[PDB]
Design an enzyme around this catalytic site. Sequence first.
Site: not given
Lengths: 16, 151
Positions: B29, B53, B109, B111
Amino acid sequence: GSVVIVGRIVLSGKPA
Amino acid sequence: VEGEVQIVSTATQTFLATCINGVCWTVYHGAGTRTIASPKGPVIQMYTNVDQDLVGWPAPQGSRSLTPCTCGSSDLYLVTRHADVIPVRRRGDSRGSLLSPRPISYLKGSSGGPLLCPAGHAVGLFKAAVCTRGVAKAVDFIPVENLETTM
Ligand SMILES: [Zn+2]
């Protein structure tokens, strides 16, 4: 557009 | 000196990547299907798993791989893009709860960042913050077992 690397994290805290 | 975690950046976003088993992994993502920049031109993803993901490129120069956790511990530690360390008790396969909830901005910020067991070994990739009214209390993560099978 490309993902660019803007910095690095050293998990051990090893100094340069 | 080499780092295991790289602070990566798109035109619109910024987040983390973590090198494990020689691959630079991060969240779909954030990266999408993008190539990663190198001094020899773009490098295309080695793995792409939109179901989970997860994407991976070959690990870049200046990098050093994390070792997958094998001790099963439930005491995790999330490392943020600011190199802050956050204790996270594990609840399930992809869920963990912050021992001390933080404003959502504190995890912003991050992930793609690592979830470490007590031995500093990778348990999973930080996937997303679970928030109540701007206060993150738990996190979702891509368990490192998913990484290992995706290879
Ligand atoms: Zn472990």
